[PDB]
Amino acid sequence: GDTKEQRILRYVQQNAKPGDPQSVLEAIDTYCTQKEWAMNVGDAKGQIMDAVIREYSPSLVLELGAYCGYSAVRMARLLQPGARLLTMEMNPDYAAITQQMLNFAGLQDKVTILNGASQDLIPQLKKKYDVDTLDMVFLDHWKDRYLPDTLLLEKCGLLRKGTVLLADNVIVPGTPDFLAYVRGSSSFECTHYSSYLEYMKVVDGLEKAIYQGPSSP
Ligand SMILES: [K+]
């Protein structure tokens, strides 16, 4: 049988326009919304992602976690000339779908997909992928990995003063440890975004946590 992620890709391949990221995004959103797997992702998640990317204009973005590639396409289409996205995902099936989604959208030249465990790959980023510090980190899909990945990024010296972390699907009482960490820490300045669409209950919540370094301003 076919996986949900493979079915999302097949729908894009059959219905979207190659080389048109907006078309790809709309197709994913339309299909997942119809199936009731995810409701109006463009409005609830994508608009917030776009606003953050446009505010900080990051040259180097690291995405931790991927499923069908929606988030990677969303970010990559807004990267400035010369900017790049590194996307790390442990599940080889999800990584493969994400690559194919970026290919279809025509964005593969701006993105490098790294299939492996974050604990193994994060310490190799500086030497293997020419990374000094990251401008933005997008934490996606796997809520329980947000905190240990953040701590490992710090240990590896990959965050600088002003590095923006944006974490998806942070909705109280979920991600209690990650929120407790960034909110409680004097090294992170935090903003929470809650998208309601037209409804009374949160559809998606995201946390922006800006690293300040270890010292006084
Ligand atoms: K804080």
Curated annotation (Swiss-Prot):
Its EC number is 2.1.1.6. One of its GO terms (biological process) is memory. Keywords: Catecholamine metabolism, Cell membrane, Cytoplasm, Lipid metabolism, Magnesium, Membrane, Metal-binding, Methyltransferase, Neurotransmitter degradation, Phosphoprotein, S-adenosyl-L-methionine, Signal-anchor, Transferase, Transmembrane, Transmembrane helix. It comes from Rattus norvegicus. The chain holds residues 45 to 261 of 264 of the full protein. Mg(2+) binds at D140, D168, N169. S-adenosyl-L-methionine binds at V41, E63, S71, E89, M90, G116, A117, S118, Q119, D140. Its cofactor is Mg(2+). Binds 1 Mg(2+) ion per subunit. Residues 1-217 are extracellular. Substrate binds at K143, N169, E198. It is an enzyme of class 2 (transferase). Catalyzes the O-methylation, and thereby the inactivation, of catecholamine neurotransmitters and catechol hormones. Also shortens the biological half-lives of certain neuroactive drugs, like L-DOPA, alpha-methyl DOPA and isoproterenol. It catalyses: a catechol + S-adenosyl-L-methionine = a guaiacol + S-adenosyl-L-homocysteine + H(+); 2-hydroxyestrone + S-adenosyl-L-methionine = 2-hydroxy-3-methoxy-estrone + S-adenosyl-L-homocysteine + H(+); 4-hydroxyestrone + S-adenosyl-L-methionine = 4-methoxyestrone + S-adenosyl-L-homocysteine + H(+); 2-hydroxyestrone + S-adenosyl-L-methionine = 2-methoxyestrone + S-adenosyl-L-homocysteine + H(+). Belongs to the class I-like SAM-binding methyltransferase superfamily. Cation-dependent O-methyltransferase family. This is Catechol O-methyltransferase. The N-terminus is blocked. GO terms for molecular function: catechol O-methyltransferase activity; magnesium ion binding. GO terms for cellular component: axon; cell body; cytosol; dendrite; dendritic spine; glutamatergic synapse; membrane; postsynapse. The modification Phosphoserine is found at S215, S216.
